[PDB]
Symmetry: D2
Subunit: 248 residues, 4 copies
């Protein structure tokens, strides 16, 4: 009955909030998980303690670093022998500062983590899937509907989001044309309740949500199980939004 | 399992092809189904036979007719006592004809069946869910990515599809704003291998499919299980495409 | 030199607000105009007085009526000898009532006026262009970004808008595939300051506009001059939004 | 005529092909142009020779380099005293190679030139417009509908394209929110017949174009004249596609 039986998944930013929600759903459905985080060893160790070290592994990872991708792939294969699913969930939020005041370094850091990182991950995953999973698998690029509560005014955040969306389409088709059965899809969470916020802000947030409340981390986990499993074999290069109607 | 335990679903055009695949998945997951068809009595009887009459019911229905909607609602409540899910799947395909040669009656028939029918269905389903299911439910509007092999040149078919897409958004928001927990989403199948695919066009159809092959009815059934179940409680007014990369 | 020199245009809903501003720009650029309205003879006469009866003509027209389209075509050809441009601008607004409370007759009226009317006009213009303009011309379907101030919750209004958008694509492609050089594009005004904007809502409306103010009828006129003229010969099946950032 | 009377415009990649087409239309409408190019001194000198030293200037520019932007702004201000319009037209095309074979350096090259360059341009333009044009101006981001003949399989090309589109929206809104009258819009050319179009590839290319022929450089120029001028004062954060129906 386990919908992800025998699957091995890598989930970046997988030790807290949304990513932890995905990992929880994956473990529930019988998947072995490798959860990564750049600077959250405590969260990492706690997740493995929660899941059990027989079905989970924590690896420190900066997703913008090509070398950390090879590190994570190697650790996943040593521990679990294969790679079936990659969830690119790690990311940086938006800021409300003026575009003409944006330092190139701050633009570049966002592109590095929210866009280029997704490419680096897809490429690493694809190679590992050809090597260990008979050239089959599933890749999921997660990017929120909004990074800011107001108008989407953050140039770097928005650019990285639009970039990742089209990256998803192009990657799927690039593989598809060559008969490689590795699917690439994107998932777009609305506002998910992962921490406390000042009540003025929270009201603003919930005001942007037609159903009048935030979602939960496992709401994202559920659509990720669908996309990770063989149930969605014909879903490819597509976008899956779970946002309480936020962009309806 | 039983991801749809005790749910009662109405599936239009549910006795052949995509609709039947949806029905199969729903029954697999514990749903009670009412499958309908305009001109397929034998198919309806045969589907009930394989599902069993304790968990399925066949009702003859022309989805373009308001009176037939009340007929199905009435029969559904008589048999199963409630309505939890409506899958608007029934509809007609596109044609090659010149725009300026199109008769109003022929335009109108397509609008009636492929667009107006979905409004009538949503309205009938909402009333039934308010009356019998504590004003909670899930409505799924199914609309193919493509109605024709080549360029989407059919004005009535395209209009109806674009129409149904925005209907889904507006209906979900209309309900959400009044705090009614009835979610409305759309599903968009690519080319699915069924008897209604024109034989002479099969090889040409496949050449438009990036993954190089048609999908199966149960591929659409799986995403419909997700959207019918409470697993998708935060998915609303959104579009779920299962198409082998066709519109990627 | 006049950018619409020798061109003959029909503009529906052309004697008030947006339609009148389109007419004003067209006349300024040397076009001859046939402006129509369903119930506004005084406005029609006043527009002709302003423009001059040598370059303009008023015809009463209900755009939802097939017979009225033939009437307008006949009168245009009788007065000006040809038809080069059709601007489908006439239409009705949205309401904020519950989807499940909507009468079919009320749904149907909006689809008749805001969707089917556009098909009728396209068909009438195409035959006229083939007959009198060497099978060349430009058709413009105008549908605003928003019909209501708040969330787009009107199902009939939204469906007709989504419907008219894809109608534009399909018609453009239907013609192009047969080598017919009649272009079909859509124009999408944001909030324009005219007498038909509800007084009570003017302040709430302006809040939804990123640039902080409404536009002017001639703002829509300018983009329509571009689309009606030979300047946009390669612009086809496309969407031109002039909305002060409304849907950005 | 002079629809761009007294306006000063910077056009990157403006000495051949599409860029040159924009430059020609701009000069026709009374604009003064600064055309740039990374490695085409000949093309640059030919353009200035054609236009005349009094209304045109050529400056060498690598759009990926922050320092070259400061150089081009300084040169424009020394020559013409102000900056009114920026057309980000410079760009790299796509390749048909496999995503998992793509080197980070080659990915990064495309992001640098086709995405980050647009940001650097916007930023420099905005500063110059606040400084010299009373905080009013128009910025146009140009990106082709397709880089490749076949499926859009280039991950870097597509990502930068999707990124540039969203950058346009966010940048427009970032400015608009602060009451800054600098509009940002994008333009999307289909296949345009320029010197870099080789044989028989022509057949495949034209086969993707519903109107059955490539467009001309001035087709892109004409819509850019609309966006650069005061005729489009309410067009903001929007996408203007001129592609003969290619993505319809």
């Amino acid at each position: 009955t386990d919908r992800l039986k025998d699957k091995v998944a890598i989930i970046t930013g997988g030790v807290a909030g949304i990513g932890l929600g995905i990992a929880e759903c994956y473990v529930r459905e019988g998947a072995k998980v490798v959860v990564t985080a750049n600077h959250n060893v405590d969260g990492g160790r706690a997740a493995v303690a929660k899941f059990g070290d027989d079905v989970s592994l924590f690896v420190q990872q900066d997703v913008s670093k090509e070398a950390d991708w090879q590190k994570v792939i190697d650790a996943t294969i040593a521990k679990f022998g294969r790679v079936d699913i990659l969830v690119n969930n790690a990311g940086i939020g938006g800021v409300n500062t003026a575009i003409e005041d944006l330092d190139l370094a701050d633009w570049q850091k966002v592109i590095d983590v929210n866009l280029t990182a997704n490419f680096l991950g897809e490429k690493a995953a694809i190679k590992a899937m050809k090597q260990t999973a008979d050239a089959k698998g599933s890749i999921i690029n997660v990017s929120s509907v909004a990074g800011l509560v107001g108008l989407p005014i953050d140039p770097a955040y928005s650019a990285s989001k639009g970039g990742s969306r089209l990256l998803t389409h192009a990657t799927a088709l690039n593989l598809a044309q060559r008969g490689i059965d590795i699917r690439v899809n994107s998932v777009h969470p609305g506002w998910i309740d992962t921490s406390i916020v000042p009540e003025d802000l929270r009201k603003q947030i919930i005001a942007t949500i037609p159903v009048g409340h935030m979602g939960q981390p496992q709401d994202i986990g559920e659509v990720c199980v669908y996309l990770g499993s063989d149930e969605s074999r014909f879903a490819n290069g597509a976008e899956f939004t779970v946002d309480g109607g936020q962009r309806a």
